[PDB]
Amino acid sequence: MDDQGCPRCKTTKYRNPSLKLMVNVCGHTLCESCVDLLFVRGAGNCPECGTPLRKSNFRVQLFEDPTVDKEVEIRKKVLKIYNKREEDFPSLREYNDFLEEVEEIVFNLTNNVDLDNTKKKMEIYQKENKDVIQKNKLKLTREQEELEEALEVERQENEQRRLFIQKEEQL
Amino acid sequence: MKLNVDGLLVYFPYDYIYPEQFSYMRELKRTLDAKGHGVLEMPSGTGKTVSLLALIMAYQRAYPLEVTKLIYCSRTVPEIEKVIEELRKLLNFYEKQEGEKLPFLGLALSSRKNLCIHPEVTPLRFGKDVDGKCHSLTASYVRAQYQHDTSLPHCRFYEEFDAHGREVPLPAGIYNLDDLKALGRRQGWCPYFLARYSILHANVVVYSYHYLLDPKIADLVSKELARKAVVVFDEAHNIDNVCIDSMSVNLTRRTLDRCQGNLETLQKTVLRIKETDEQRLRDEYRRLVEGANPVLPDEVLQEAVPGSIRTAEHFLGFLRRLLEYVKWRLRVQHVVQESPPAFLSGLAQRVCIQRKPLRFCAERLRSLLHTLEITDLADFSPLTLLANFATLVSTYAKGFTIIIEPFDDRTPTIANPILHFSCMDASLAIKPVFERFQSVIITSGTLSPLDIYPKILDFHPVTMATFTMTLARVCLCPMIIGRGNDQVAISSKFETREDIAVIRNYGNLLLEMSAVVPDGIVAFFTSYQYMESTVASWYEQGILENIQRNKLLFIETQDGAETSVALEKYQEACENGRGAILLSVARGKVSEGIDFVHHYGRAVIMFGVPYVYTQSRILKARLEYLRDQFQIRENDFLTFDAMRHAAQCVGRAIRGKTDYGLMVFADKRFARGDKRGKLPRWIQEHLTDANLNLTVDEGVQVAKYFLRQMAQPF
Numbered sequence: 001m002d003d004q005g006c007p008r009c010k011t012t013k014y015r016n017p018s019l020k021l022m023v024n025v026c027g028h029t030l031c032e033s034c035v036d037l038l039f040v041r042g043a044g045n046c047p048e049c050g051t052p053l054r055k056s057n058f059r060v061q062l063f064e065d066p067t068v069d070k071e072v073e074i075r076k077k078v079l080k081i082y083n084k085r086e087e088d089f090p091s092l093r094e095y096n097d098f099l100e101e102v103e104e105i106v107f108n109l110t111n112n113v114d115l116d117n118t119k120k121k122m123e124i125y126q127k128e129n130k131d132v133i134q135k136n137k138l139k140l141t142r143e144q145e146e147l148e149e150a151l152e153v154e155r156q157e158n159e160q161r162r163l164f165i166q167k168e169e170q171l
Numbered sequence: 172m173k174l175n176v177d178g179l180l181v182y183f184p185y186d187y188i189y190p191e192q193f194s195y196m197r198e199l200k201r202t203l204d205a206k207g208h209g210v211l212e213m214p215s216g217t218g219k220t221v222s223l224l225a226l227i228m229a230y231q232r233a234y235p236l237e238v239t240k241l242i243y244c245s246r247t248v249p250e251i252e253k254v255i256e257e258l259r260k261l262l263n264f265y266e267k268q269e270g271e272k273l274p275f276l277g278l279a280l281s282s283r284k285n286l287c288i289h290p291e292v293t294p295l296r297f298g299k300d301v302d303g304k305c306h307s308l309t310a311s312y313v314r315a316q317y318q319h320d321t322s323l324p325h326c327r328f329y330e331e332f333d334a335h336g337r338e339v340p341l342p343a344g345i346y347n348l349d350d351l352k353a354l355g356r357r358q359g360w361c362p363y364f365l366a367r368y369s370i371l372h373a374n375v376v377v378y379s380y381h382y383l384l385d386p387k388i389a390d391l392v393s394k395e396l397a398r399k400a401v402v403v404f405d406e407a408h409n410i411d412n413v414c415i416d417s418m419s420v421n422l423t424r425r426t427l428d429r430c431q432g433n434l435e436t437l438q439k440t441v442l443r444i445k446e447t448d449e450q451r452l453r454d455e456y457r458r459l460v461e462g463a464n465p466v467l468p469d470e471v472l473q474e475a476v477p478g479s480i481r482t483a484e485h486f487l488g489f490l491r492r493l494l495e496y497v498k499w500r501l502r503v504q505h506v507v508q509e510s511p512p513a514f515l516s517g518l519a520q521r522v523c524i525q526r527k528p529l530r531f532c533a534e535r536l537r538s539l540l541h542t543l544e545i546t547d548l549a550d551f552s553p554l555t556l557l558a559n560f561a562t563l564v565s566t567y568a569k570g571f572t573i574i575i576e577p578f579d580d581r582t583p584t585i586a587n588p589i590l591h592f593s594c595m596d597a598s599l600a601i602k603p604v605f606e607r608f609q610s611v612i613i614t615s616g617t618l619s620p621l622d623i624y625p626k627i628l629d630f631h632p633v634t635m636a637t638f639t640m641t642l643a644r645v646c647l648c649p650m651i652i653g654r655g656n657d658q659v660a661i662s663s664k665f666e667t668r669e670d671i672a673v674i675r676n677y678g679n680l681l682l683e684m685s686a687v688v689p690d691g692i693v694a695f696f697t698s699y700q701y702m703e704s705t706v707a708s709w710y711e712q713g714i715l716e717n718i719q720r721n722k723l724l725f726i727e728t729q730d731g732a733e734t735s736v737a738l739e740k741y742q743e744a745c746e747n748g749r750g751a752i753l754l755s756v757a758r759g760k761v762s763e764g765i766d767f768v769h770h771y772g773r774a775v776i777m778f779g780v781p782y783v784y785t786q787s788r789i790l791k792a793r794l795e796y797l798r799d800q801f802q803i804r805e806n807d808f809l810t811f812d813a814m815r816h817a818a819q820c821v822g823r824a825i826r827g828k829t830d831y832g833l834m835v836f837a838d839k840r841f842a843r844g845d846k847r848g849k850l851p852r853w854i855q856e857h858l859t860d861a862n863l864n865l866t867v868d869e870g871v872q873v874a875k876y877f878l879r880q881m882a883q884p885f
């Protein structure tokens with residue numbers, strides 16, 4: 001919302017900040033009033049670049065920095081790969097070496113051509129999915145579930161503490 | 172004067188000691204013999220330092236192996252200067268007694284800003300600026316370039332110190348800060364680094380808390396060398412607040428914008444470095460793979476690996492992501508939100524920033540920023556603050572909390588929101604001191620009752636004794652006035668604050684007390700806004716003009732320059748027969764910094780019990796967490812915070828040399844048993860039921876009579 005305005009229609013960005021960026025394969029600071037303008041003609045084409053889009057390639061995002069928008073979306077996609085837990089590797093260096101390669105992949109995708117990254121990702125898809133990728137999908141789902149359970153346990157304990165001290169006072 | 176203490180024989184410079192001094196020395200010797208941390212209170216502002224220092228020196232002589240050295244800390248450098256003066260006098264006395272020099276060293280540490288000899292940094296007074304300039308001059312890059320001896324300003328003092336002081340340490344002696352500056356000038360060495368090295372072999376070292384509490388700078392000079400040392404904190408009743416401040420980090424919108432600009436400059440500098448010199452500075456990557464100071468204490472700090480951030484670009488992107496998350500989280504407009512662990516979890520989920528890589532953020536910032544050969548760290552200081560916050564949050568949140576304030580107090584609508592990371596318990600940050608050092612003595616004056624302190628700070632005290640000053644004459648005659656001439660309650664309650672009758676009672680009491688009291692009087696209010704409201708009411712009425720006629724009136728303001736000018740004029744007014752009435756705030760920095768002595772602040776007036784506003788959400792976390800853990804009632808802790816502050820701001824008049832003076836508290840709340848009980852023992856025992864709730868007129872009459880009694884000689 002801190003951006004000066006859209007490259008084309010920098011108006012709404014001044015009147016109100018309600019508009020949120022729209023991510024695309026192009027990687028852009030697109031705005032809803034401008035998304036309508038893209039829908040009317042082209043229907044999934046970047047105005048200046050002209051990059052084709054299958055179905056408008058539009059998804060909501062909330063950060064004034066377009067570079068952060070693209071980086072966060074690319075990282076979201078990448079996290080689906082190389083999600084194996086650290087303890088799977090006993091080697092000290094290998095704990096974060098693969099994370100280094102992951103972030104290198106992210107930076108490569110942000111600016112440089114993604115053809116090599118896609119070919120490499122196909123290679124990692126075939127070799128790792130056989131066993132480890134689906135296993136770590138399961139384990140990360142388990143840890144998400146148990147963290148939401150633990151936060152609800154914390155909030156049950158806080159509600160019980162509030163209501164029991166109230167019943168202390170009234171009793 | 173050699174005192175045959177029960178433990179041993181202890182020298183003493185002055186001729187006579189009061190029985191309270193005997194009690195202090197015996198209790199202190201008991202604690203040292205037990206070799207266990209403890210806390211004790213002594214009334215006198217001065218005299219306690221000499222007794223403590225003499226006992227510690229005698230104990231060191233008797234059992235040198237038991238205690239390696241003494242680490243005596245004081246609130247402020249102007250105060251610690253008086254301590255070094257006392258130590259110098261004691262050493263001169265002992266040296267005269269022995270007839271020869273002994274291998275004893277005593278020194279005081281202080282900031283490079285306070286003491287330094289470089290003309291370039293001399294004109295600048297801002298501490299971050301001095302730190303950055305000194306880092307630039309002493310940088311490893313500058314040292315290597317000095318080896319080349321190219322045409323460039325190089326700070327010769329550090330180089331000469333490295334050449335000479337490394338080989339030869341200072342034999343012995345006592346050096347004040349000012350005298351150490353002269354020694355550094357004469358020897359072409361650093362008064363700072365020379366003392367830093369002497370810490371390795373020094374019998375006595377003195378420096379303020381922020382040199383011994385904050386893990387960033389405290390640890391480096393408080394390394395494990397002093398495994399068994401007598402660490403002592405003087406007048407450290409406000410130790411919890413400073414220990415919390417050593418951890419709390421405040422993030423603001425302006426600071427975040429400055430961080431973003433600094434980060435842009437960092438990126439540009441990285442590009443320039445890549446195009447100019449790349450391989451030599453890339454060797455940093457190799458040493459990183461092998462594996463401003465970190466805020467993580469000894470055991471909490473970790474150095475396994477930097478993490479996923481292994482290159483300049485990767486680290487820069489990580490900081491960009493975290494800064495964007497903080498920016499948005501702060502921009503959100505809503506009620507105050509608290510989230511110690513939920514903040515970390517939400518950060519990791521929303522922006523994909525794992526806590527383990529986030530942990531080493533500040534350390535990797537230090538290393539990478541060093542690689543960049545920046546001009547100075549002053550420009551990038553906001554980024555380092557944000558990095559310290561980023562590493563701290565990922566380090567721990569069990570006894571912490573992140574508070575967000577989209578709207579600031581005293582402003583219906585302001586575009587400068589603030590994110591606080593205020594701590595809740597000081598035990599977390601003060602644990603290393605207690606654990607590392609065999610025994611710590613928290614010697615304090617005006618101490619609110621000791622029982623609370625073990626609860627707030629997790630330690631097992633050895634002795635719990637309150638020492639009462641005993642003199643042939645009643646130096647202090649405190650009183651509490653709750654009933655005015657109208658026989659109306661004068662409590663300064665929030666709902667009763669607006670009461671014009673109460674304000675009038677305060678004004679009339681001040682008028683009469685200024686009429687009778689001799690030159691020099693200080694009145695402490697509860698807040699700036701309350702003080703201004705009372706002053707305005709008195710101005711609308713004729714009371715204020717009469718007070719002005721009777722005696723000069725000075726007022727305190729938030730601005731330090733005006734505060735200093737007003738206090739400077741107040742001192743001259745006290746010296747002259749005009750007199751002065753200094754209105755100030757209990758929480759004001761002036762109240763804690765200033766010390767009142769004979770013919771200074773003769774009658775200390777306390778207008779209302781000092782209570783912090785019940786809306787500041789930081790205190791809500793700090794207080795409800797104490798209720799949940801350590802089991803302290805909210806009202807108990809609030810009244811303790813009021814009584815400790817009042818004792819701090821009212822205990823100055825009895826500084827030393829047996830200078831008479833009266834402490835009047837114009838509030839019926841102090842008459843309550845709980846307030847009296849929590850009041851320090853020495854003041855309370857002097858206080859009696861006869862004068863507990865004197866009317867305004869009766870208090871004035873008894874004050875006049877007591878001043879008559881104290882006027883005559885011994």
Ligand code: SF4
Nearest residue numbers: 287305326328329361
């Ligand atoms: S190296 Fe020594 S003399 Fe030079 S600026 Fe730093 S403290 Fe001052």
Ligand SMILES: [Zn+2]
Nearest residue numbers: 006009031033
């Ligand atoms: Zn637009």
Ligand SMILES: [Zn+2]
Nearest residue numbers: 026028046049
């Ligand atoms: Zn485009």
